[PDB]
C-alpha cells in the first residue's frame, strides 16, 4: 500500500450535527411519508458522519429515530432503503463540487444535495416544487 493523495470531496469528510430543519414536514409530505413517520423523523436531529476510502464514499446518519448507513461510487447506482422505508435506485455524483443525490422509485424521484457554504454543510431536499433546507455544522 501507499498513501493516497487527497481529493475536492475531502470538504466533506468529517462529523456533522443538524442544525436547522426548514419546510422538512412539507417535504416529506411530497415524498409520500406517513404522519407517525413524519411526526419522528421530523424530531430527529442526526450526527451525519462522512468518510471516504478510495473510490468508495460513506454516508452515516445517526439519530434517535433511525440509523443509516450507504457506501457508494460516484456516478454508480445502488439500491438504498431510506430512512422512512422507500426501497429506491440511488445516484450520487459530483456537479461543481455539491454532491447530489437523486433517489428514484414508483416513478417518482427526488433529489438530496449537499454543499459546503462557509463553515456549514448544506442540505437541499427537493420533491417536485418542495424545497427543505438543512444546515449542518461540524460536531
Ligand atoms: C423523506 C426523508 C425522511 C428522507 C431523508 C431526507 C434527508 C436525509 C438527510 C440528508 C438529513 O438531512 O437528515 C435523510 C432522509
Given at each position: 500500500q501507499q498513501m493516497?493523495?487527497?481529493s475536492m470531496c475531502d470538504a466533506f469528510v468529517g462529523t456533522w450535527k443538524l442544525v436547522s430543519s426548514e419546510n422538512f414536514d412539507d417535504y416529506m409530505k411530497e415524498?409520500?411519508?406517513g404522519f407517525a413517520t413524519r411526526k419522528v423523523?421530523?424530531?430527529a436531529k442526526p450526527n451525519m458522519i462522512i468518510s471516504v476510502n478510495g473510490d468508495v464514499i460513506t454516508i452515516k446518519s445517526e439519530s434517535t429515530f433511525?440509523?443509516?448507513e450507504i457506501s457508494f461510487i460516484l456516478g454508480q447506482e445502488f439500491?438504498?432503503?431510506t430512512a422512512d422505508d422507500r426501497k429506491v435506485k440511488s445516484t450520487?455524483?459530483?456537479?461543481?463540487g455539491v454532491?447530489?443525490?437523486v433517489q428514484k422509485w414508483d416513478g417518482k424521484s427526488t433529489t438530496i444535495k449537499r454543499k459546503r457554504e462557509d463553515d456549514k454543510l448544506v442540505?437541499?431536499?427537493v420533491m417536485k416544487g418542495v424545497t427543505s433546507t438543512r444546515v449542518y455544522e461540524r460536531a
Amino acid at each position: 500500500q501507499q498513501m493516497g493523495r487527497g481529493s475536492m470531496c475531502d470538504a466533506f469528510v468529517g462529523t456533522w450535527k443538524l442544525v436547522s430543519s426548514e419546510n422538512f414536514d412539507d417535504y416529506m409530505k411530497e415524498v409520500g411519508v406517513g404522519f407517525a413517520t413524519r411526526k419522528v423523523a421530523g424530531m430527529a436531529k442526526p450526527n451525519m458522519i462522512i468518510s471516504v476510502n478510495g473510490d468508495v464514499i460513506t454516508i452515516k446518519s445517526e439519530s434517535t429515530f433511525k440509523n443509516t448507513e450507504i457506501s457508494f461510487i460516484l456516478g454508480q447506482e445502488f439500491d438504498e432503503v431510506t430512512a422512512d422505508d422507500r426501497k429506491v435506485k440511488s445516484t450520487i455524483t459530483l456537479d461543481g463540487g455539491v454532491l447530489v443525490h437523486v433517489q428514484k422509485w414508483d416513478g417518482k424521484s427526488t433529489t438530496i444535495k449537499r454543499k459546503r457554504e462557509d463553515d456549514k454543510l448544506v442540505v437541499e431536499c427537493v420533491m417536485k416544487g418542495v424545497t427543505s433546507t438543512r444546515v449542518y455544522e461540524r460536531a
